[PDB]
Design a protein around this nucleic acid. Structure first.
Lengths: 122, 106, 111, 127, 167, 197
RNA sequence: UUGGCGGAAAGGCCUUGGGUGCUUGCUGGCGAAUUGCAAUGUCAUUUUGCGUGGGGAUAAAUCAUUUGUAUACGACUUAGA
RNA sequence: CCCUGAAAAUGGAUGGCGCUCAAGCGUGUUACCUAUACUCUACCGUCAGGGUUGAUAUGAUGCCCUGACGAGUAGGCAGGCGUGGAGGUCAGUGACGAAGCCUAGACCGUAAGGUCGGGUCGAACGGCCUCUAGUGCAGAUCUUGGUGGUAGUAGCAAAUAU
RNA sequence: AAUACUGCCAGCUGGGACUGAGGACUGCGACGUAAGUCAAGGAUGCUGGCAAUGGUUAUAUGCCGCCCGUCUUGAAACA
RNA sequence: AAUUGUUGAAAGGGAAGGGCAUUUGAUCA
């Protein structure tokens, strides 16, 4: 959602040219972040390795309002409330156990060929 | 021996087609060294192989081959018609295929 | 149409290869002399050779012999029509018109 | 355990979809003949979809035949399963979706006892 | 019942096939294929290697030899469609090939479940091969360069057209 | 046969050479064309100049930067000729185009390689004796090309170097022929003559 | 390994001396199989990361403030350890 | 044959590239490519000509044999799928899960449609032979409800000023 | 005399592609003195490999493909 | 369902969407 918005040099670090400085959304996100941090502290997760692994913003039911236009016409003037959710997680990913054996099927000619290579090579 | 080849080089030109309609079931193969149907009527019934390579092993090898046979001659330039068990992906309009010498009558 | 004088060899080839009879308003193939005798024995014709003879030499029962035979459905000529434009006269360089004895080659190519 | 039958061939393995089904959401994926005066599908131009025709049928000898060679029969109880006692070579049982597991296990046991193939053996069963 | 009843059930009685008037006849080999002929194999492990035709087995595969002191192909059976018969020929008179036959090369079909997921030759077979190749080289040595010719392997070079090459 | 085929542009008809090279590229053979400034076109110099002026006249009215790009170099003219012959819009045509490499003169990575001529696209073999032709280099330098002298000097230097190389090669070839003649008149020579080779 | 030539895209070529193999130019010996009548019957190259040894040095840009030869915002042009 | 006669407005048409003992023009001869065209074969449907109660054995509206054909707007006829209800039957299914919904999962039927596997879910539902209709949507500037591009855009600039 | 051209062979033969429908016998024919056999009212024998072929969907490639319904002789229309 | 946000997969030189056949990726008896 950056149609017909102004450009700035503060967004150059992200590679984009059009960026803004929202206020209400930033305060709401910061409040929910502090709530998540408090929840993690209460649960027992240290804040050293906590990273925001999920976030989601959906549209809430609209609060209908009214506006007045020319020639005695009534138009649509509601809001767009947000449903915000977020999940922070402790980061821990060193290595896995890979896949299974993945047994291959060998033709008789293929088996003879590998036997020949084994017999010939040291 | 520096050369170990038991086949004949061929180029996949295109399918048996028309101005606006093409038939993927039949392809056209040009044989190097053949210029007329009189000498093109020697590689008839021979098996053509497209030998391509993928990045995933199927049954121990990453090289997969599509097989077909020469049906008849097409044109006066030595081009021949070919019918494959599975039609060529049409991305190989100019690729190199191997026409084997079997079944051999000579 | 293209029409011309046929020969015995091409008549025999036509009757042998694409020879079909008309029995009970059906196109029953002629692979034995029994069917020909059953459907044409009243006119003295009882074999495929007799039918060919009646075709080549016009006789008393040529009308019935021709009516018994289904029209021959031939294919396109194997060696081509030999002309660039079919819809021109034979003297004008096409398949349209009388071909006289030249019809034998075209008939055998198409058969 | 199938009777010797000719290889099943399908003249059209694809699904006949209605025109503009992928263009408009109101148009569902159910075939409807185009009756428009200038409909390209109805006029059967080159490069458009193919209308179903009488020629796309299947051989009556290999019609209604599953790839396993057994005709599909819907069953709901043991008494229904007893119908295919002397016809197990051509017909295969199929438990409907409304039968609970307590009857499904009994139906499967009876089918195994009588040598009747079931097209859905792993249905509503514990993993 | 979800489905009421099939009105008529097909009879589960198999029908015998009709009598077929398709007899078998011996294979008619090509005029260029005559025992003692030098052959070039096109497909298989020993492709390009040159061999000698000895006997026509009853199973429509030619008995061929790769005499072991020349190139190392064993006494085998080869299909008629995977061989090119060269012009040169070395006779095989005095070489007994009556012992070799179809049941000589017994497959002994491998076991089903136990596949070679990991990890031989008969002394009788070695003995027959030695007996054959002794006389084979004894006759072959009468003409120059045949031993080196058969030891060398056939290959196709650039500019070589098989339709104009008289193999 | 050769993975890359080098074709000289001397005395070669533009249209016939373009058709041959386009057919080869569609077949799947890598082709590099050198000395494209020496290509010859049938008709007179004034005729081809008028044709090129007519081509130049064509341009987009509202924005001349989006109109036809009338390239002036002889190599670019040859490339445009082949592009008018190959379907560049399709991916196959694009691949055929990338298979092409057209240069003016004899590049450094191609001076020491064999050059091949097209017998069915040569002016001396197709044009009637006494017919008027033109030079692509002269046409380009009259139309607006500005690098006629540079390529001429480079070609002169390359010709001098190649002449020295051919002098050395001719000396070596004479020595080899003398060695073969001395080796002749022997039993191996008679057997080879009897067996053809 | 010594030297020379090549700038158009040189990035390649020639050459000097030694070492490491082969040499089918000619004459011998040894083994080739149970891969079963063909089933591409691999050995070439285009990138990314990983692991092992030798080798080369420890930097800039943007935002922030400000300048004005610049401008709607961008952007341009400057400066301040 | 060619040339003057022969001049119209965005930049362009033998399609263009291009072609000159032509790849231009007239004529003569072969080879080559193809239409849902022609010949044969496999399958489906329709029509016509027939056989088949000497059976346990049922569907003679069933089965099989032979031949021919298969385009199409308005329109007519015929054969079939599905929806809301009622009668007979399945002594039908189901709280250990009925209906509904979702499901680039599977099967059958050329097709309308049917069926299975999994998740959600919570009290009803289905097959067979018939009767009945308020029985099938893609449009009618269709009636109602909700939702998108525009769009975080126009704009929130009269009335002296914080 | 030979040869060119045309037409005939119920003369022979080499190579390649598609198709395998029907399912105990019924008929028309040939070989064989005779048993019996056959290319004679629709393909069988042997052998090899695997227990990958193939179905659905996404992308890619070669070709084709104008927007649904109505009015109209004429629709995709700048109706 | 229209619409919207994240995760997972694919494509994107002035459109997307479809048909004729196949390669590759995912999945399937």
């Amino acid at each position: 959602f950056n149609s017909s918005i102004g450009r700035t040099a503060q967004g150059k670090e992200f590679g984009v040219t059009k960026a803004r400085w929202p206020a209400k959304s930033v305060k709401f996100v910061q409040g929910l972040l502090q709530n998540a941090a408090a929840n993690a502290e209460a649960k027992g997760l240290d804040a050293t390795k906590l990273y925001v692994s999920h976030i989601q913003v959906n549209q809430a039911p609209k609060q209908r309002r009214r506006t007045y236009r020319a020639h005695g016409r009534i138009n649509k003037y509601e809001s767009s409330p947000s449903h915000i959710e977020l999940v922070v997680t402790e980061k821990e990913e060193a290595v896995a156990k890979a896949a299974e054996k993945k047994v291959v099927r060998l033709t008789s000619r293929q088996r003879g060929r590998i036997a020949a290579q084994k017999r010939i090579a040291a | 021996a520096e050369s170990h080849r038991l086949y004949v080089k061929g180029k996949h030109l295109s399918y048996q087609r028309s101005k606006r309609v093409n038939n993927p079931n039949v392809s056209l193969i040009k044989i190097e060294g053949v210029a007329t149907p009189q000498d093109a009527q020697f590689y008839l019934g021979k098996r053509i192989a497209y030998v391509y390579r993928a990045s995933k092993e199927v049954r121990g090898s990453k090289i997969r081959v599509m097989w077909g046979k020469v049906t008849r001659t097409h044109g006066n330039s030595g081009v021949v018609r070919a019918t494959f068990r599975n039609n060529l992906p049409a991305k190989t309009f100019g690729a190199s295929v191997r026409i084997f010498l079997y079944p051999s009558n000579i | 149409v293209a029409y011309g004088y046929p020969s015995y060899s091409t008549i025999r080839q036509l009757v042998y290869k694409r020879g079909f009879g008309k029995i009970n308003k059906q196109r029953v193939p002629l692979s034995d002399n029994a069917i020909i005798e059953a459907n044409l024995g009243k006119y003295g014709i009882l074999s495929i050779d007799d039918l060919i003879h009646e075709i080549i030499t016009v006789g008393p029962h040529f009308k019935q012999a021709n009516n018994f035979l289904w029209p021959f459905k031939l294919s396109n000529p194997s060696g081509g029509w030999g002309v660039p434009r079919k819809f021109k006269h034979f003297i004008q360089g096409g398949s349209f018109g009388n071909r006289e004895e030249f019809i034998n080659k075209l008939v055998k190519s198409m058969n | 355990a199938s009777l010797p039958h000719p290889k099943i061939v399908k003249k059209h393995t694809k699904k006949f979809k209605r025109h503009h089904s992928d263009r408009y959401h109101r148009v569902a994926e159910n075939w409807r003949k185009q009756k428009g005066i200038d409909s390209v599908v109805r006029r059967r131009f080159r490069g458009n979809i193919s209308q179903p025709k009488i020629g796309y049928g299947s051989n009556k000898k290999t019609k209604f035949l599953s790839p396993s060679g057994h005709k599909t029969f819907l069953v709901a109880n043991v008494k229904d399963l007893e119908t295919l006692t002397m016809h197990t070579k051509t017909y295969a049982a199929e438990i409907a979706h409304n039968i609970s597991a307590k009857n499904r296990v009994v139906i499967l046991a009876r089918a195994k006892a009588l040598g009747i193939k079931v097209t859905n053996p792993k249905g509503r069963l514990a993993l | 019942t979800a489905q009421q009843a099939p009105k008529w059930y097909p009879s589960e009685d198999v029908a015998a096939p009709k009598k077929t008037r398709k007899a078998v006849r011996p294979q008619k080999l090509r005029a260029s294929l005559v025992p003692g002929t030098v052959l070039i194999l096109l497909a298989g492990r020993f492709r390009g290697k040159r061999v000698v035709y000895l006997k026509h087995l009853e199973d429509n595969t030619l008995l061929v030899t790769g005499p072991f002191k020349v190139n190392g192909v064993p006494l085998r059976r080869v299909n008629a469609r995977y061989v090119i018969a060269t012009s040169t020929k070395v006779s095989v008179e005095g070489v007994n090939v009556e012992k070799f036959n179809v049941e000589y090369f017994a497959k002994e079909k491998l076991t089903k479940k136990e596949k070679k997921e990991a990890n031989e030759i008969k002394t009788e077979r070695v003995e027959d091969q030695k007996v054959v190749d002794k006389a084979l080289l004894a006759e072959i040595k009468k003409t120059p360069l045949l031993k080196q010719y058969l030891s060398a392997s056939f290959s196709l070079k650039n500019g070589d057209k098989p339709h104009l090459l008289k193999f | 046969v050769e993975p890359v085929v080098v074709i000289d542009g001397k005395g070669h008809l533009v249209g016939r050479l373009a058709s041959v090279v386009a057919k080869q590229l569609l077949n799947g053979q890598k082709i590099v064309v050198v000395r494209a400034e020496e290509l010859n076109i049938s008709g007179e110099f004034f005729r081809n100049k008028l044709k090129y002026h007519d081509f130049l006249r064509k341009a987009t009215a509202f924005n001349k930067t989006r109109g036809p790009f009338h390239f002036r170099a002889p190599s670019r003219i040859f490339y445009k000729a082949l592009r008018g012959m190959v379907s560049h819009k399709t991916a196959r045509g694009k691949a055929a185009l990338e298979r092409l490499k057209v240069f003016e003169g004899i590049p450094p990575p191609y001076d020491k390689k064999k050059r091949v001529v097209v017998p069915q696209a040569l002016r001396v073999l197709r044009l009637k004796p006494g017919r008027k032709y033109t030079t692509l280099g002269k046409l380009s330098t009259s139309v607006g090309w500005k690098y006629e002298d540079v390529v001429a000097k480079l070609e002169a230097k390359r010709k001098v170097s190649s002449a020295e190389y051919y002098a050395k090669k001719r000396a070596f070839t004479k020595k080899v022929a003398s060695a073969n003649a001395t080796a002749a008149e022997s039993d191996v020579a008679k057997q080879l003559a009897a067996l053809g080779y």
